Each structure stands twice: as structure tokens, then as C-alpha cells.
Design a protein around this nucleic acid. Structure first.
Ligand SMILES: [Mg+2]
Ligand SMILES: [Mg+2]
Ligand SMILES: [Mg+2]
Ligand SMILES: [Mg+2]
Ligand SMILES: [Mg+2]
Ligand SMILES: [Mg+2]
Ligand SMILES: [Mg+2]
Ligand SMILES: [Mg+2]
Ligand SMILES: [Mg+2]
Ligand SMILES: [Mg+2]
Ligand SMILES: [Mg+2]
Ligand SMILES: [Mg+2]
Ligand SMILES: [Mg+2]
Ligand SMILES: [Mg+2]
Ligand SMILES: [Mg+2]
Ligand SMILES: [Mg+2]
Ligand SMILES: [Mg+2]
Ligand SMILES: [Mg+2]
Ligand SMILES: [Mg+2]
Ligand SMILES: [Mg+2]
Ligand SMILES: [Mg+2]
Ligand SMILES: [Mg+2]
Ligand SMILES: [Mg+2]
Ligand SMILES: [Mg+2]
Ligand SMILES: [Mg+2]
Ligand SMILES: [Mg+2]
Ligand SMILES: [Mg+2]
Ligand SMILES: [Mg+2]
Ligand SMILES: [Mg+2]
Ligand SMILES: [Mg+2]
Ligand SMILES: [Mg+2]
Ligand SMILES: [Mg+2]
Ligand SMILES: [Mg+2]
Ligand SMILES: [Mg+2]
Ligand SMILES: [Mg+2]
Ligand SMILES: [Mg+2]
Ligand SMILES: [Mg+2]
Ligand SMILES: [Mg+2]
Ligand SMILES: [Mg+2]
Ligand SMILES: [Mg+2]
Ligand SMILES: [Mg+2]
Ligand SMILES: [Mg+2]
Ligand SMILES: [Mg+2]
Ligand SMILES: [Mg+2]
Ligand SMILES: [Mg+2]
Ligand SMILES: [Mg+2]
Ligand SMILES: [Mg+2]
Ligand SMILES: [Mg+2]
Ligand SMILES: [Mg+2]
Ligand SMILES: [Mg+2]
Ligand SMILES: [Mg+2]
Ligand SMILES: [Mg+2]
Ligand SMILES: [Mg+2]
Ligand SMILES: [Mg+2]
Ligand SMILES: [Mg+2]
Ligand SMILES: [Mg+2]
Ligand SMILES: [Mg+2]
Ligand SMILES: [Mg+2]
Ligand SMILES: [Mg+2]
Ligand SMILES: [Mg+2]
Ligand SMILES: [Mg+2]
Ligand SMILES: [Mg+2]
Ligand SMILES: [Mg+2]
Ligand SMILES: [Mg+2]
Ligand SMILES: [Mg+2]
Ligand SMILES: [Mg+2]
Ligand SMILES: [Mg+2]
Ligand SMILES: [Mg+2]
Ligand SMILES: [Mg+2]
Ligand SMILES: [Mg+2]
Ligand SMILES: [Mg+2]
Ligand SMILES: [Mg+2]
Ligand SMILES: [Mg+2]
Ligand SMILES: [Mg+2]
Ligand SMILES: [Mg+2]
Ligand SMILES: [Mg+2]
Ligand SMILES: [Mg+2]
Ligand SMILES: [Mg+2]
Ligand SMILES: [Mg+2]
Lengths: 64, 76, 51, 96
RNA sequence: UUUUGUAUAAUGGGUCAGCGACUUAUAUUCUGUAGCAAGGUUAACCGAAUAGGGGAGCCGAAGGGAAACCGAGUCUUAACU
RNA sequence: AGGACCGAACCGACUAAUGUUGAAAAAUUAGCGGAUGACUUGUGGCUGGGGGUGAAAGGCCAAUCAAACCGGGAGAUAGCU
RNA sequence: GUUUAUUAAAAACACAGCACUGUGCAAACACGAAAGUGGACGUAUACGGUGUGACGCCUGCCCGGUGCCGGAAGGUUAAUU
RNA sequence: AAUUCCUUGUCGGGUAAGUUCCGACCUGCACGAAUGGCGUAAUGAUGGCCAGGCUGUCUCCACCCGAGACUCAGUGAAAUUGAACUCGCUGUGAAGAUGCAGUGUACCCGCGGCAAGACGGAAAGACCCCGUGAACCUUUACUAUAGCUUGACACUGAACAU
RNA sequence: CUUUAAUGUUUGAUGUUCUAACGUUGACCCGUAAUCCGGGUUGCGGACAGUGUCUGGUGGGUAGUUUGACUGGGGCGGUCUCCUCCUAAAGAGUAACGGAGGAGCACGAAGGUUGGCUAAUCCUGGUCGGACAUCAGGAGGUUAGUGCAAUGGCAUAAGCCAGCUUGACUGCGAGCGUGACGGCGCGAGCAGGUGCGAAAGCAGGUCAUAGUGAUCCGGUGGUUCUGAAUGGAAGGGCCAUC
């Protein structure tokens, strides 16, 4: 049978032009008053999945 | 029984030693207070982190009436 | 513990707000600092409202 | 994706975005595709009848990729600034 | 066989003969090899036809952005050195 | 007269020895309790498994019982040997 | 008298007797998706449930807690509207 | 004390001598009134203790009568078993050795006996811990649920009075 | 606008009475050789009882399951995240149910800047006034101080006092530190707009190192995004926040 994609994982990653993945940063959903603007500002643009993880991510998204 | 606690180590200390070639930005020392004082072309952060303000080479020296230790960037 | 959370609101009608904390027992005085609203791109009055 | 009990990566990260139903029925077209059609006109329909775009595409744009070297007229497509000048350099016109 | 470590007084086998354990299907990625190459390849089905037909489709030649959208650029911001 | 008394058949099972790959998957030998009664026994019938039946021991329900047996889900699952 | 058929026969279970409580008869209660049936071809001197256990002398104080029985002024409270 | 931890409590009796027994005391670790209290004739293959009688139970065993054991003839099992040319001692070593080191002893092979060892045979320890194993049991653990119960609408109507 | 009264009248609430639904495990008749059932006659009950649907209570009667880990065996006790010192062997890091202590905040000033200022403690003299209050002098030299532990800092003070103020700004960020990762930390300089200072300059919270919680699912405000025939809308995205 066709492999099934891990559906939660496909809502947290998009693949890029050289076959990396971009995700939103953690820590920016609630409890914000006590966080500094600097910290929050840097946490706002999307990031690239690191090399340790990138095996775990491809397993989950075979049709990405 | 009343003991058994400790905190996580902060990796403080010298990151760049005398003569090393650094780029503007690079951290030189991490410290608590000014065990070292910023000299020429060196800034001091809000946790007393000393960093190079200009590309060049790290230089330590003792100077002043208190015999304090200073860190400077020779712009070699 | 005791310090509540509040929002300071632009006077420039933009909507934009900052957030901060306040001891209401000791200092119950609607706090009015002056901050930079970036929707009109000028410093204006901000006035304590409720979170 | 199981890591032994540690909250896995695809769960300690937040979800983001929404999918567009428009993007599905949209297409791009290369300059190397303009000769491929029969007729020297490029409409949405000629593209579909030359099997350049699928039968359910409603909007198409021409981008600067490859090269046109034959006069063509292009009706109803959007065209990028760069691709526009390429089509014109051949001696082709861009109606709507 | 299991272990840091077994002549071990730790495990298993009285002996012989026969049988007894990494397979199959379908997807996906990488390596080798073959064909064709900015293209490659068809599925069901038609066909007596391992031929021939069938290009529905799939993959690739363009990306960026949550998205509208723009496009060799794009997003970010009022604007980027 | 009697859930009276002594005591065979009949119904039991307190002690000891033997036996423990037995003569026997619970017996034999010597003694032991009841023996007109809530007694004992033949033939047939009824109660069916989270159910029965139990002067109650979780006892018994075909040498199987804190949930019978037989077939099916079934190649349950086994981070263990 | 009864009991762990097969390591326990007993001080355990049962028992006559005693008390509390339920039950007015299409009884309570029990087996039944139901129809029905047991209770009982009985009717409160009867029937079910619970504890205690011949007989003798007796069975003290506590209703705050938990259950049950009675109350219904007020507080809180469902579907519905 | 079928209850007493301390405890073989203390005093009395029984015995040459009695952690048990019988009678008392009260300091009841931690009795007590129908999950009954205290008594009680009779009854008991019921628990504890003491006497007479009787005895191989014992001092301390002896002899005898039978059935095996032993020999001959016939028939003919079993558990177990990596392979064996299968001794002692003192050391050593997966730390308790027929098998290693040193040494001592020992001609080859049966039969009747005995059980010190082969960590002897039998049952993948029942104790103990572990597994995000199991079952069944309890409850004011959680979630449900049959049963019992409340109300609303339906089957379900009429007349009067307030 | 009627404070409010009567009559009709749509309707509820309460009881009385009635019979025709419905009950009858009362009597009698027939099917009928029948203590079943049905039909019939009569009596008694009667919109009650009872049953369906919906609903609150109760419910170990029955069912499915949960009931942590570390641990000189397990259990009991203690512990589980974060900060500081030591152990730690003069770079970083480094274990034990090793030795000692803290945190789960507080501050619109206790933040920014400008101007100014220097501690503890003892002695001598001095109304109440005492070992210790406030005053004057001397010695002293940080033995003080730091909103709260410990360590490292601190006089150009980071310690103490005043005036004016909101940089406890918004967008970004060369480069570097620390982590397996998620992440966390430091940062010169650009752009916009501020405060203090004559100015040079300084300021993106606080002497520094604790004061903390991923994701999901929801809430609130904003929004040149999306909007299942089309215009809207609902919902979704994005930015701020709970
Ligand atoms: Mg958000
Ligand atoms: Mg430390
Ligand atoms: Mg700074
Ligand atoms: Mg966990
Ligand atoms: Mg096509
Ligand atoms: Mg071992
Ligand atoms: Mg060896
Ligand atoms: Mg050994
Ligand atoms: Mg051996
Ligand atoms: Mg063993
Ligand atoms: Mg072995
Ligand atoms: Mg083996
Ligand atoms: Mg073996
Ligand atoms: Mg090839
Ligand atoms: Mg008799
Ligand atoms: Mg007798
Ligand atoms: Mg007799
Ligand atoms: Mg007899
Ligand atoms: Mg006799
Ligand atoms: Mg007798
Ligand atoms: Mg029979
Ligand atoms: Mg069954
Ligand atoms: Mg039991
Ligand atoms: Mg049996
Ligand atoms: Mg079961
Ligand atoms: Mg199955
Ligand atoms: Mg199996
Ligand atoms: Mg008897
Ligand atoms: Mg019997
Ligand atoms: Mg027995
Ligand atoms: Mg017996
Ligand atoms: Mg009992
Ligand atoms: Mg009935
Ligand atoms: Mg009793
Ligand atoms: Mg009361
Ligand atoms: Mg009373
Ligand atoms: Mg009540
Ligand atoms: Mg004793
Ligand atoms: Mg005496
Ligand atoms: Mg005595
Ligand atoms: Mg006594
Ligand atoms: Mg008692
Ligand atoms: Mg008691
Ligand atoms: Mg009483
Ligand atoms: Mg009582
Ligand atoms: Mg009694
Ligand atoms: Mg007594
Ligand atoms: Mg007697
Ligand atoms: Mg007896
Ligand atoms: Mg006796
Ligand atoms: Mg005697
Ligand atoms: Mg023979
Ligand atoms: Mg040894
Ligand atoms: Mg030895
Ligand atoms: Mg030797
Ligand atoms: Mg021999
Ligand atoms: Mg023997
Ligand atoms: Mg053995
Ligand atoms: Mg085992
Ligand atoms: Mg249960
Ligand atoms: Mg299950
Ligand atoms: Mg379980
Ligand atoms: Mg444990
Ligand atoms: Mg070190
Ligand atoms: Mg070192
Ligand atoms: Mg280690
Ligand atoms: Mg440690
Ligand atoms: Mg301060
Ligand atoms: Mg100053
Ligand atoms: Mg004085
Ligand atoms: Mg002075
Ligand atoms: Mg000091
Ligand atoms: Mg300051
Ligand atoms: Mg960079
Ligand atoms: Mg000025
Ligand atoms: Mg501080
Ligand atoms: Mg949910
Ligand atoms: Mg629109
Ligand atoms: Mg629409």
C-alpha cells in the first residue's frame, strides 16, 4: 500500500528549494508579557530544521 | 538528606586568548563582574561580557593605579 | 504573585498596545507613560486599560 | 518520529499557515513552452490543447524561463515584466 | 548460549537420520547498471498478438511567501546599507 | 416414647504403619464415628458458565474450577527468554 | 448433625430459641427484554431479609459521624418554555 | 485470658526439680454486654494438665515364626545421559575441583552392602524483585451502566366551582 | 397617562363530580370434553394507574480500567525544575540517598540621564540622653553599602541624594557564545521616532548570575490575506495578547 504521511508533521513543515524544511519557532503562543521584545522579535520569522532532526522529519513526510 | 542540590554550569571564562585573530563581534571573556575591564576597541555587555568592536588581535595588559587587568584589540 | 497584568493603549486610536504589570494595592493610579505607536510612527500618550 | 517519550519534534513545534484552493487551479508557463503550441496564439485553451496545462487550470502566468524566438500573441494570461520584454523582443504582442 | 568474566559445580543437547527460522506483496528513498535525454514514461483498456495502439496521468525543467500575489527573484519593514 | 443406648449389614473417614516408577492418578491393614433418622440407597427427571448448586470449605458442576469443556476471532499481544 | 471428593472434621457451618426490619395480597422478594412462574392453591399465630445462637442470670451510657425513618417553612436545582 | 507486649509478672498448690497446668491478685501493652457478657448439667475420633492400671516407648536390646533381600531356571521395565582412559590432599580459579598447579597414593575385573560427594534425579523457584504482564476480590479511586426513583410531553376525555 | 372595577373571553393552577379511553390476577355466558386465550354480559376502579420518548437523582448490583520513577534488594522516609559555593585534579565540562545554602519575586522608580556626594567602628566633649538616638571634633580607610542566597564585581563607584523625564522605544542586525535537538544568551552598527545634557555623549529596563512551562484546544483586539455558483457572511490565516 501507499505510505501514509504523518499528517500533524505536514502542518509544521514545508520543503524548500534545496530540500531543507522551514518551521515556525517555539515559545511564541502565550505568556508574552514577561518576554522581552528582542527575544520575541527574533522568534517571529521561520527557521530551518537542523541536521540532527532532518532524518526524523523525512521519515514522517515521504511525499513532501 | 538536606543536601543534594546544585545549579547548571555556565561555561564562563576566556574564549579568545592573547594573540588570537578575531572578528568584530566575537566574545573574548565571559565573567561575573569586571574581573577584566574593557580596553581599546572592546565593549562591555550587560552581563559584563567583553567583545571585540573591531577586527584585529586580542591583547591583555595590566595598567593603571589599581593594577587592573585590561583587554584590548590591536587592530593588526 | 501579587502584581497583576495590564495593557497600555495608544491615544492615536490605532488599537496598538503594550503590556506590563502593576501592584494595585500600593499604587492604584491609572498609569500613563508615553510610548512609540508604530502604526502612526510617533510617540503619543498611552493609558492603562484592563487585560 | 517517536523519540522514546520525549515530546517529538513534529509536536513540540507549532502549526502554521493555511492551504489555498486558488493555488491549485493556477499555473506557470515557460518561454520554451510558447513555440510548443500550434497556431502562434497562446490562450488558456491552446495551452490545454497542447497539453501544457491541465484541464482544470483557470489562471496562468508566463515567467522568464528559456527563450521565445518566434512571434506569438498572448491573450488572457498574466506575464512578468521580464517575460513581457522577451516576448516583445521576438516581435510578439501581449493582448488581454 | 549468556556475560565484566565460565573447565566451570550457570543454560541446552542420550545418539543417528529426515524436517526446522530474515519471506511475500505494495509504496518510498539511496547505490550499481541499461535505455532515452530538457525531457522521460505510460495506467486501465483495445489487441490472438510479450508486438502495435492508448500520454488519462505521474515526475522534471523556478522559486519566494501563511496567503492574495509577485517572479530569477521573492519575503521581511514605512524603508533596508 | 426417643435427631435415646450397645452393636453387624449399610453409610462414613479420627489415628498409625505400609505403599509413593503403587495391587490402586487417594488404596490396603489394624483400630475409629453414625447405625429409626436433618438416615441410607435403585431408577427416572429438573437447574448451564459471570451461570447453576452450596448445613459456606471459594466447596462442587465427568480424574479439569477466584469463572467448565469444545470450536472460532487467532499466526491475540510478548520493550521478555 | 454438616464441611475443604484427593494433606485441615475443628473452637468453623447448621441448629431449636431470641430480636430487629420489611410485607394488606396482582404481598414483599426472586427467575425472566416479555408473557409468565416460584412465594402459595399460603394471607400478618403468614411470608421474606438481617444478626445472634440451648438453658440460667442479664444485656449499661453515646443519635456528634454514616445509614435508615419522618418532616417540608426556606435555600439550591433538570428536561421543558 | 483461644485476648498480657514487657513475661518464665507476682503469690499459693502439684513435682527431687513444672517457660505447660490448676487457684488467686489487678499493673486490662490492647476484655466487656445479641459482629452478645458472665455462668452452665449432659454431650465431643475437640485443645491443655495430672493419677492408677498396663506395657520393648525407653535403659538396651536378645531370640524366634513367616514374606522380600541372596543363588539357579524362564520372562523382562524405568527415571537419567555433551563425551570419558570417571583417585586423595593442599593451593588456584565465575570466589566450595575426578578433570588446573604441585604433590601423595594406586596391578586388571566382578558380587553383596552403606549413603559423604558428583552444588546427585524430578518440576524454565511458588520466596524476592522486575514487566508502563494477567486474573479475580474491595472501596466515600475514575468513567460508565442494569435496576430503583423524579418531572415534561404522548396514549388522555367531559362538566362545575374557587 | 386610566391609580384601577365589572361583563364577555384566549388560557393556565387547584380541587370536586362524571364515563367513554385504559386497568381488572371479581362474578356469569359462549367458542368448549378447557382454572390458557378470545369474544360477550355485569360489577369495581378510572383519566388515576400503567407503558414509550426525553430528563434530574440514586446506583461496587454489574462492567472497563488506573494506582509513577529514582533507590548500595524492595518497602518506609527523602528526592524530581531553577540559582550560588565546594568536591572538580590552575581552559571548558565532570558522579554519588556527597558537603553547605537559596528561588517560584519585587520595583513607573528601586528604570533613563544630568548635577552633587562618600562608608563601618572606636575615642574626646556635650540638655533631658542611658553601652547604644541627635550635635561637634579626632582616629580610621570600606572592617560599610548593594530590595532578597552565595559567588564574582563595584570609588570613573554598580554604594548615597537631588532636578528633569519614559530608551521598561518600533523595525532590524555584522559577528560570536552555549546546547543532541526544541531552544537560551551576548552584540556593535543601520532606519524611524524619543528623553536627559551647553556639549562630547548616554539610554532597546535594574551591579551580574534564580523569579519558570513546549504543543494542542480555546478566548480578546487588530488585519492591502482567504471567503466551496456569485456579492456578503461564518469559519480559517497573519500580527498583538490571555
Ligand atoms: Mg498567537
Ligand atoms: Mg555552578
Ligand atoms: Mg548596552
Ligand atoms: Mg512523560
Ligand atoms: Mg494532460
Ligand atoms: Mg553474573
Ligand atoms: Mg578459563
Ligand atoms: Mg564455582
Ligand atoms: Mg563435573
Ligand atoms: Mg541452576
Ligand atoms: Mg554445564
Ligand atoms: Mg545453550
Ligand atoms: Mg540437560
Ligand atoms: Mg541513467
Ligand atoms: Mg440413635
Ligand atoms: Mg454415641
Ligand atoms: Mg453404635
Ligand atoms: Mg462399625
Ligand atoms: Mg470400640
Ligand atoms: Mg460409641
Ligand atoms: Mg439418578
Ligand atoms: Mg462462553
Ligand atoms: Mg478464605
Ligand atoms: Mg473434578
Ligand atoms: Mg474472565
Ligand atoms: Mg485479530
Ligand atoms: Mg502466538
Ligand atoms: Mg457429632
Ligand atoms: Mg464427606
Ligand atoms: Mg481433604
Ligand atoms: Mg482428614
Ligand atoms: Mg466462618
Ligand atoms: Mg409480573
Ligand atoms: Mg456466631
Ligand atoms: Mg440528629
Ligand atoms: Mg436512644
Ligand atoms: Mg428524607
Ligand atoms: Mg509469654
Ligand atoms: Mg509454688
Ligand atoms: Mg509457682
Ligand atoms: Mg490461671
Ligand atoms: Mg470480643
Ligand atoms: Mg473490642
Ligand atoms: Mg448494647
Ligand atoms: Mg453490638
Ligand atoms: Mg457466643
Ligand atoms: Mg467464660
Ligand atoms: Mg466433658
Ligand atoms: Mg470430635
Ligand atoms: Mg480432653
Ligand atoms: Mg502414668
Ligand atoms: Mg534370573
Ligand atoms: Mg579462592
Ligand atoms: Mg579447593
Ligand atoms: Mg594434579
Ligand atoms: Mg557395588
Ligand atoms: Mg539405600
Ligand atoms: Mg537438582
Ligand atoms: Mg524462572
Ligand atoms: Mg470492579
Ligand atoms: Mg482493554
Ligand atoms: Mg489492570
Ligand atoms: Mg521502582
Ligand atoms: Mg575548571
Ligand atoms: Mg583541569
Ligand atoms: Mg559520568
Ligand atoms: Mg551530584
Ligand atoms: Mg538599582
Ligand atoms: Mg553621576
Ligand atoms: Mg553619646
Ligand atoms: Mg566625625
Ligand atoms: Mg563588608
Ligand atoms: Mg543606578
Ligand atoms: Mg549572521
Ligand atoms: Mg537639548
Ligand atoms: Mg540583582
Ligand atoms: Mg479537543
Ligand atoms: Mg474577496
Ligand atoms: Mg460565496
Amino acid at each position: 500500500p501507499k505510505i501514509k504521511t504523518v499528517r500533524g508533521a505536514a502542518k509544521r513543515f514545508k520543503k524548500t528549494g534545496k530540500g531543507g524544511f522551514k518551521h515556525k519557532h517555539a515559545n511564541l503562543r502565550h505568556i508574552l508579557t514577561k518576554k522581552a521584545t528582542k527575544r520575541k522579535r527574533h522568534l517571529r520569522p521561520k527557521a530551518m530544521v537542523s541536521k540532527g532532526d532532518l532524518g526524523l522529519v523525512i521519515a514522517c513526510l515521504p511525499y513532501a | 538528606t538536606r543536601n543534594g542540590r546544585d545549579s547548571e554550569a555556565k561555561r564562563l571564562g576566556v574564549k579568545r586568548f592573547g594573540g588570537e585573530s578575531v572578528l568584530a563581534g566575537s566574545i573574548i571573556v565571559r565573567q561575573r563582574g569586571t574581573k577584566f575591564h574593557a580596553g581599546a576597541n572592546v565593549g562591555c555587555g550587560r552581563d559584563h561580557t567583553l567583545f571585540a568592536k573591531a577586527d584585529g588581535k586580542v591583547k591583555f595588559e595590566v595598567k593603571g593605579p589599581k593594577n587592573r587587568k585590561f583587554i584590548s584589540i590591536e587592530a593588526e | 504573585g501579587i502584581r497583576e497584568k495590564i495593557k497600555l493603549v495608544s491615544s492615536a486610536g490605532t488599537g496598538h498596545f503594550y503590556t506590563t504589570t502593576k501592584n494595585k494595592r500600593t499604587k492604584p493610579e491609572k498609569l500613563e507613560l508615553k510610548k512609540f505607536d508604530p502604526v502612526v510612527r510617533q510617540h503619543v500618550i498611552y493609558k492603562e486599560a484592563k487585560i | 518520529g517517536f523519540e522514546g517519550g520525549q515530546m517529538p519534534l513534529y509536536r513540540r513545534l507549532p502549526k502554521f499557515g493555511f492551504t489555498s484552493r486558488k493555488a491549485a487551479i493556477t499555473a506557470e508557463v515557460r518561454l520554451s513552452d510558447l513555440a510548443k503550441v500550434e497556431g502562434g496564439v497562446v490562450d488558456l485553451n491552446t495551452l490545454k490543447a497542447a497539453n501544457i496545462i491541465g484541464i482544470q487550470i483557470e489562471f496562468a502566468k508566463v515567467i522568464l524561463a528559456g527563450e521565445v524566438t518566434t512571434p506569438v500573441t498572448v491573450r488572457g494570461l498574466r506575464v512578468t515584466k521580464g517575460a513581457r520584454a522577451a516576448i516583445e523582443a521576438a516581435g510578439g504582442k501581449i493582448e488581454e
